[PDB]
Design a protein around this ligand. Structure first.
Ligand SMILES: [Mg+2]
Ligand SMILES: [Mg+2]
Ligand SMILES: [Mg+2]
Ligand SMILES: [Mg+2]
Ligand SMILES: [Mg+2]
Ligand SMILES: [Mg+2]
Ligand SMILES: [Mg+2]
Ligand SMILES: [Mg+2]
Ligand SMILES: [Mg+2]
Ligand SMILES: [Mg+2]
Ligand SMILES: [Mg+2]
Ligand SMILES: [Mg+2]
Ligand SMILES: [Mg+2]
Ligand SMILES: [Mg+2]
Ligand SMILES: [Mg+2]
Ligand SMILES: [Mg+2]
Ligand SMILES: [Mg+2]
Ligand SMILES: [Mg+2]
Ligand SMILES: [Mg+2]
Ligand SMILES: [Mg+2]
Ligand SMILES: [Mg+2]
Ligand SMILES: [Mg+2]
Ligand SMILES: [Mg+2]
Ligand SMILES: [Mg+2]
Ligand SMILES: [Mg+2]
Ligand SMILES: [Mg+2]
Ligand SMILES: [Mg+2]
Ligand SMILES: [Mg+2]
Ligand SMILES: [Mg+2]
Ligand SMILES: [Mg+2]
Ligand SMILES: [Mg+2]
Ligand SMILES: [Mg+2]
Ligand SMILES: [Mg+2]
Ligand SMILES: [Mg+2]
Ligand SMILES: [Mg+2]
Ligand SMILES: [Mg+2]
Ligand SMILES: [Mg+2]
Ligand SMILES: [Mg+2]
Ligand SMILES: [Mg+2]
Ligand SMILES: [Mg+2]
Ligand SMILES: [Mg+2]
Ligand SMILES: [Mg+2]
Ligand SMILES: [Mg+2]
Ligand SMILES: [Zn+2]
Ligand SMILES: [Zn+2]
Lengths: 99, 144, 95, 149, 129
RNA sequence: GUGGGGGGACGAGCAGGGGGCUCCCAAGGGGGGUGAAGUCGUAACAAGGUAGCCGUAGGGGAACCUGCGGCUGGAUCACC
RNA sequence: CUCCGCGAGUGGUCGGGGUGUUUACUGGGCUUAAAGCGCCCGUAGCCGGCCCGGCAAGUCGCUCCUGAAAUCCCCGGGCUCAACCCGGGGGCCGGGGGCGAUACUGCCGGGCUAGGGGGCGGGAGAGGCCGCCGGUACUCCGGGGGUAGGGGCGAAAUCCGUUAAUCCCCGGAGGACCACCAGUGGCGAAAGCGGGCGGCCAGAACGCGCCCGACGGUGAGGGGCGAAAGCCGGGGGAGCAAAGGGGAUUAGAUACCCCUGUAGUCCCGGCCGUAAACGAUGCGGGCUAGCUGUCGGUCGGGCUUAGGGCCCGGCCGGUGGCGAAGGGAAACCGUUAAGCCCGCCGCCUGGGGAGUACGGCCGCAAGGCUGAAACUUAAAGGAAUUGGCGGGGGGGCACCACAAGGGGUGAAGCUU
RNA sequence: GUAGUUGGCGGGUUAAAGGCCCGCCAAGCCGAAGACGGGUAGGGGCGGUGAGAGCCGCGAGCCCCGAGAUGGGCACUGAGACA
RNA sequence: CGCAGGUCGCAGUGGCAAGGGGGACCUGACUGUUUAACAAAAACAUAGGUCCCCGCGAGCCCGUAAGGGUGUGUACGGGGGC
């Protein structure tokens, strides 16, 4: 399920150091961190750029925003997002009500 | 729950394979095909063998019966395995001595296993130093 | 040997049941296999002479259902051990 | 499902043992063929066209009056479907199920329905390849078959 | 799924005869079923045979005369030779004078008596007694 | 007819690793099973004296106990 | 001592066959005795609708070249008969060539609609995913009332409470569940699914002169889904609660009772892949009395809470009960078969050893799947009958029972 | 699983065809209809048993074919041996 | 980068340059740090684990005091142990 490794993929740079549990934690976080995400603005499946921890950038639409340390949106952060970017869902709700 | 299974006119080979698959559920066929008797039997498939008597022993009959069936410990020449061989006949043990060459033979019983009330004895003595123990017991011959 | 054709519970063509909790108990079973005996129930029975038609004293009655597992249903006498012939008789459980 | 269903119904139409032209019919075979081609150009599939002929126009069955079948008439009159009607219907159903599964990834019942539909698609493709009604290189690729939806 | 119309029709006839009915309706049918019924009627086990033209292939209504003790289609359809007729005779029939096997041969479907008369073989189909 | 040096195919044998399948030997264990009844309790059979059993997890001299879901092979084929 | 069996033989142990319908093609079984994979998709294989035309591959008939001899079966003959030898026919289960036949199977072509699939219409459904909302109950918190108990049990005690408890009122917060209606009721392949509204899907039944024209069944291997508990990471945590602590009980009590209590139970992503995952009953199709409750659709009649309603009758399809024929060791199944048949798959072959050991594969782990033999044993086992017993139920009776009574014995001395 | 392995082309050798061997060229060949791996075994006519289907090999002795001559190799002669 | 042929020596990475290898136990996970001048280690540190003081006018610490550090900080944090 990785390019050349079985289970230790992004953590393969660590070799046999630091312990299986530590490397597993790192792999679990990094597979989400370095995967593809839906941009909160343009909704594109893109590899967002993490400029620092908590600072994310979409290369498609140029949306720069604040998110999680290693993932663009945390579980709590999804529920308390700004209402400006949830315009599509509001339109869907009004369409389902009126139709 | 209906219609055996491969009953077609061109299902002959499939039916043969299916029937051959379930022959391995039979203990007799599996034993004959895998050669377990010639691997694990002390007699190694022979109807009789030779041995040297080491000690005289007495086994206790099974629970409802009360008796001390008298046997010997015999070391087979061809394998060296030591097995308990029942010495039959009244006073038959007194014709047996230590370091005596004996002919060891299957005790009978169901499937070559132990006999009626003797627990775990599969063999019995037929010859003592080249003379049959039956003839010795009957007086027709004398033990050499 | 299989006692009863019901499996001990009239469950119906389904795989799993929602199941309930027993009164005075909790061993219990699903919605079927449980006893649901109903009683009329009213507070202060025969005071209707000294109440009700004295003062104004308007009382209320409330039909009440009690749910019991097999152990309690046998224990409070709501279920007996009937013979094999009488096992298939359809009787109501005294309300 | 296909196997071990709960019910096995008998619902179907019972036609006459040997259908013939109705005596009361006011439409000749040629007019029947033009009406069928009109409904085809309007865009109805052959099953719907037959229902329309039976209901609105009182045509009981195209085969006795014209001696042909409805898809044969449409094929002769310049109407040729991309794929056969049932195969196209199954493919459209599968595409709709996949579009639903895109936004609902945990719909296991929908996944099983999609598996049933795709198995039906595979059986129909095997039959059509055997009878030559489709090219022998045809393969069910839902990503490249989006245009049929 | 229906597989063998001959075995289906024969077992339907056996069920109706067990229930003591006067007539049995046979659907679907084929020419093999028709010729088998013809041989049975010729030997008296089956009475009159009426054809019905429903649109779905036809039906056969067969009158039963209380003459069948057991009927059935030999399946698989074993190729039998003239010299091999007798062992199948003893295999499927009771008594040397009772019952008949039905055989499909290159000259048509006939009884085992007619096959032994013609000195031919073929494919076994059924038995009656 | 030859005697040297070299190359070639075949090719024993002796040196060695490589692997496998076999078979024995071993201080010590490790879970087990058969006797004959020796000790401790009484877990199963009766609503077996806490109804029983299945999977699983934890706990306990031990049979076993408890939690969760399931079954009746329950001691119920039975509400209004 | 006497009798029995066979006899120039008669016994012992082995191996094969019979035994054995315990390998089942003929010809077994899988509800409970051993045995249906937890469920479904599907590859090879096997099995497959009707009619017409062609072929003649399988098939059938005859014939030829063959299948060494001996052996085997029949016949005649020769050893005294015999065993045996000689002579003739047959077979020695097959291969190939020639000539025929076309019913069946196969192939090729054309045509169908009966199985299958795709449709249209009005309904049914706790079918699924997603979102929003509610119902009481509950716990906790804040305030007001009002004292001193509460809670628990067989009895208590631990415990809660005088910093105001339990109970009542006024407010807020939170997590679970969806009472009655509600059913051998519904949906789903199984697991499983029960508040309302909406959106997006799925799968059936019914009605049909709709479309295609056999496109089908089963399915080794290969898959995908799959309770609870458990595991990995994150969130949440009201109630309950393994582990644990305490109070009791007991000979003991590391249990059963009470107080408390953590994982866990809930949500998200993944793993696990097991269950009495059961109807202990594989899937598909046909035939075979009925009577009765209920669910969906539909048609005929009657009524009408004029409604999508109710009642009666028919069909189709589910779901229960009793019960023809038939079946079964029996309990019992019996149109929802465990009956009569046609296919295909899986499994069983006395018990224990033993779901053990080894190997392999899978898993983060727990573990899971697959899965023996040595040795030991003569039964283990199913259904039913009679009894015996029970700290199951019901009835009857009794101063060798009780109740109401009277006299006592048990303590002292003495007789025994 | 296979890497002279599968096939083609051109040759050598042979009494004679052939990856039999050699030079070049390609990636082919086998396998769940069970490769490959392991185990067992000379094959057949035939034999024992059972009413038969069938099961077994006592498939030792007799006849036919095969292989070998303590293990492993290689040659002479000759129509013919690697005796 | 490869192929074919020929050819010399004892020796062709010919000088220069340039790993001996393997099995097992103890111990510290590892990289890192240490007694300048007799100890380089199994000592220290380490990531990871866990406990405690703390809601900021805090906790802890420095200063005689004025005042200061942690702090241009805020429990996903500062400080203190193992
Ligand atoms: Mg015994
Ligand atoms: Mg269940
Ligand atoms: Mg197929
Ligand atoms: Mg007990
Ligand atoms: Mg108990
Ligand atoms: Mg415990
Ligand atoms: Mg506790
Ligand atoms: Mg049996
Ligand atoms: Mg069983
Ligand atoms: Mg099942
Ligand atoms: Mg299994
Ligand atoms: Mg299971
Ligand atoms: Mg032919
Ligand atoms: Mg002769
Ligand atoms: Mg022969
Ligand atoms: Mg011969
Ligand atoms: Mg299938
Ligand atoms: Mg499978
Ligand atoms: Mg769980
Ligand atoms: Mg808690
Ligand atoms: Mg509690
Ligand atoms: Mg089962
Ligand atoms: Mg049975
Ligand atoms: Mg019944
Ligand atoms: Mg197993
Ligand atoms: Mg293992
Ligand atoms: Mg009794
Ligand atoms: Mg009294
Ligand atoms: Mg006294
Ligand atoms: Mg040549
Ligand atoms: Mg070669
Ligand atoms: Mg016999
Ligand atoms: Mg000899
Ligand atoms: Mg040699
Ligand atoms: Mg020689
Ligand atoms: Mg140097
Ligand atoms: Mg170190
Ligand atoms: Mg270092
Ligand atoms: Mg120093
Ligand atoms: Mg130093
Ligand atoms: Mg240290
Ligand atoms: Mg650590
Ligand atoms: Mg400490
Ligand atoms: Zn963007
Ligand atoms: Zn209860």
């Amino acid at each position: 399920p990785f390019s050349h490794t079985k289970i230790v993929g992004p953590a393969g740079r660590y070799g046999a150091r630091y312990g299986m549990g530590i490397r597993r934690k790192v792999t679990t976080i990094e597979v989400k961190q370095r995967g593809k995400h839906r941009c909160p603005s343009c909704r594109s499946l893109v590899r967002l750029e993490r400029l620092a921890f908590g600072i994310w950038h979409c290369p498609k639409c140029g949306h720069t925003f604040a998110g999680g340390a290693y993932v663009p949106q945390t579980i709590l952060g999804k529920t308390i997002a700004p209402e400006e970017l949830k315009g599509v869902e509001a339109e869907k709700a009004k369409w389902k009500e009126a139709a | 729950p209906g219609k055996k299974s491969p009953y077609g006119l061109f299902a002959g080979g499939k039916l043969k394979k299916k029937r051959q698959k379930f022959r391995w559920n039979d203990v007799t066929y599996k034993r004959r095909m895998l050669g377990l008797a010639e691997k694990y039997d002390p007699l190694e498939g022979a109807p009789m063998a030779r041995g040297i008597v080491l000690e005289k022993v007495g086994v206790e009959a099974r629970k409802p019966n009360a008796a001390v069936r008298k046997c010997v410990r015999v070391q087979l020449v061809k394998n060296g395995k030591v097995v308990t061989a029942f010495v039959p006949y009244d006073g038959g043990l007194n014709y047996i001595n230590e370091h005596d060459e004996v002919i060891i033979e299957r005790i009978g019983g169901p499937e070559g296993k132990s006999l009626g009330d003797i627990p775990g004895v599969r063999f019995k003595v037929v010859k003592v130093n080249g003379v049959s123990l039956w003839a010795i017991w009957r007086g027709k011959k004398q033990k050499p | 040997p299989k006692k009863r054709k019901n499996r001990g519970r009239k469950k119906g063509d389904k795989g799993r049941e929602p199941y309930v909790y027993c009164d005075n108990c909790g061993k219990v079973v699903p919605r079927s296999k449980a006893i649901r005996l109903t009683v009329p129930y009213s507070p202060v029975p025969p005071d209707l002479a000294r109440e009700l038609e004295k003062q104004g004293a308007i009382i209320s009655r409330y039909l009440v259902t009690k749910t019991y597992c097999i152990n309690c249903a046998v224990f409070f006498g709501i279920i007996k051990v009937r013979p094999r012939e009488e096992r298939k008789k359809r009787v109501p459980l005294q309300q | 499902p296909h196997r071990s269903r709960h019910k096995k119904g008998r619902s179907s139409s019972v036609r006459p043992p040997h259908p013939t032209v109705p005596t009361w019919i006011q439409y000749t075979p040629e007019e029947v063929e033009q009406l069928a081609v009109e409904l085809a150009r309007r865009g109805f599939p052959p099953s719907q066209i037959g229902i329309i002929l039976r209901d609105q126009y009182g045509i009981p069955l195209v085969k006795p009056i014209t001696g042909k079948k409805l898809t044969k008439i449409l094929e002769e009159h310049g109407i040729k479907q991309e794929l056969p009607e049932d195969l196209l219907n199954l493919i459209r159903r599968a595409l709709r199920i996949r579009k639903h599964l895109e936004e609902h990834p945990k719909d296991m019942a929908s996944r099983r329905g999609l598996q049933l539909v795709e198995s039906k698609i595979h059986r129909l493709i095997k039959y059509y390849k055997r009878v030559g009604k489709i090219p022998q290189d045809f393969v069910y690729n839902p990503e490249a078959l989006s245009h049929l939806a | 799924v229906m597989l063998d119309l001959l075995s289906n029709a024969l077992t339907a006839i056996k069920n109706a005869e067990a229930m003591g009915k006067r007539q049995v309706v046979i659907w679907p049918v084929n020419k093999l079923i028709y010729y088998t019924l013809r041989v049975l009627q010729r030997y008296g086990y089956v009475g009159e045979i009426e054809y019905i033209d429903d649109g779905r292939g036809g039906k056969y209504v067969v009158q039963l005369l209380g003459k069948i003790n057991d009927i059935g289609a030999i399946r698989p359809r074993f190729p039998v030779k003239y010299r091999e007729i007798v062992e199948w005779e003893q295999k499927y029939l009771p008594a040397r004078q009772i019952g008949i096997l039905v055989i499909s041969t290159s000259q048509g479907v006939m009884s085992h008596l007619e096959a032994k008369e013609k000195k031919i073989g073929g494919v076994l189909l059924a038995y009656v007694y």
